């Protein structure tokens, strides 16, 4: 018998799916939004470079 209130087995290792990690962390913009603004264009360029990296 293992101690009462304790887990008999060790917690399961968490294996990372890089495809899922990429999908949740650096997801692509869902729509091709209209970046007519100067600040919108800069933000779009920075986001694209960050996602590529």
């Amino acid at each position: 018998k293992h101690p009462k209130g304790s887990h008999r087995l060790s917690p399961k290792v968490n294996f990372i799916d890089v495809d899922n990690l990429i999908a949740k962390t650096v997801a692509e913009p869902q729509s091709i939004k209209s970046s007519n603004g100067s600040a919108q264009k800069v933000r779009l360029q920075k986001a694209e470079l960050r996602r590529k990296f």
């Binding site: 018998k1 293992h2 101690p3 009462k4 209130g5 304790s6 060790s10």
Partner: protein
């Protein structure tokens, strides 16, 4: 993984669900340039209270269970402590029965000796009446009684000789038979080994298959097993 140690249970039954386990680890002492064993006692959780003092157990790290308890019993590697408890209980019953039997065999022997001390008749005197009545023809009722004191219904010269037999005599004959067997076994094997042809035949006669193709030790054991199967089984 969780840190596991091997140790001997050194205390049990003093705390509820807690035992003390002695863990010895190997360390190097730079000062004396020697690899030493370092010892430490662990307070260990025993959920099932199965372990006993003397057991060899494996303890595994757990969550904090008390101020000083951080390990639990994970397996009983050897259960010498549990065996000790079982053998002690059995001994009390086993010894009581034997002592009762021996006490009854001592009182019985005492009664027989007391009974014999109540019979004034003595072996010498009784054997002097069975040898005078057998040489004179008189048959006083004492003889009939003597035929009950000893069970010797018939009074002949070959009945007093069987009333006075000493165990030593039997031992002397058993010893001669024992010596004969040993001497015969040795001479038989000694001769067999001297004659390889008679040896090969000997093995085949006793049921060996191609004894010729055998080693000295692999075959002398067969010869020894056969010589001792021809002087101890037939007798």
């Amino acid at each position: 993984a969780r840190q596991n140690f091997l140790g001997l249970v050194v205390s049990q039954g003093k705390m509820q669900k807690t035992v003390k386990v002695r863990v010895e680890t190997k360390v190097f002492n730079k000062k004396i340039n020697k690899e030493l064993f370092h010892r430490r006692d662990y307070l260990v959780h025993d959920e099932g209270e199965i372990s006993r003092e003397g057991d060899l157990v494996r303890i595994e790290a757990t969550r904090p269970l008390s101020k000083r308890k951080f390990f639990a019993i994970a397996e009983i590697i050897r259960n010498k402590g549990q065996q000790f408890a079982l053998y002690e209980s059995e001994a009390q019953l086993s010894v009581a029965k034997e002592e009762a039997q021996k006490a009854k065999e001592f009182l019985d022997k005492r009664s027989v000796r007391e009974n014999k001390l109540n019979e004034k008749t003595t072996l010498l005197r009784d054997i002097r009446t069975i040898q005078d009545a057998l040489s004179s023809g008189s048959t006083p009722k004492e003889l009939l009684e003597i035929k009950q004191r000893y069970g010797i219904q018939d009074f002949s010269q070959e009945t007093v000789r069987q009333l006075l037999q000493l165990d030593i005599s039997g031992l002397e004959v058993n010893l001669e038979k024992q010596r004969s067997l040993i001497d015969r076994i040795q001479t038989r094997l000694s001769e067999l080994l001297s004659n390889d042809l008679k040896c090969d035949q000997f093995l085949k006669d006793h049921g060996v298959e191609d004894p010729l193709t055998l080693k000295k030790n692999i075959k002398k054991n067969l010869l020894r097993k056969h010589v001792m199967m021809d002087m101890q089984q037939p007798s």
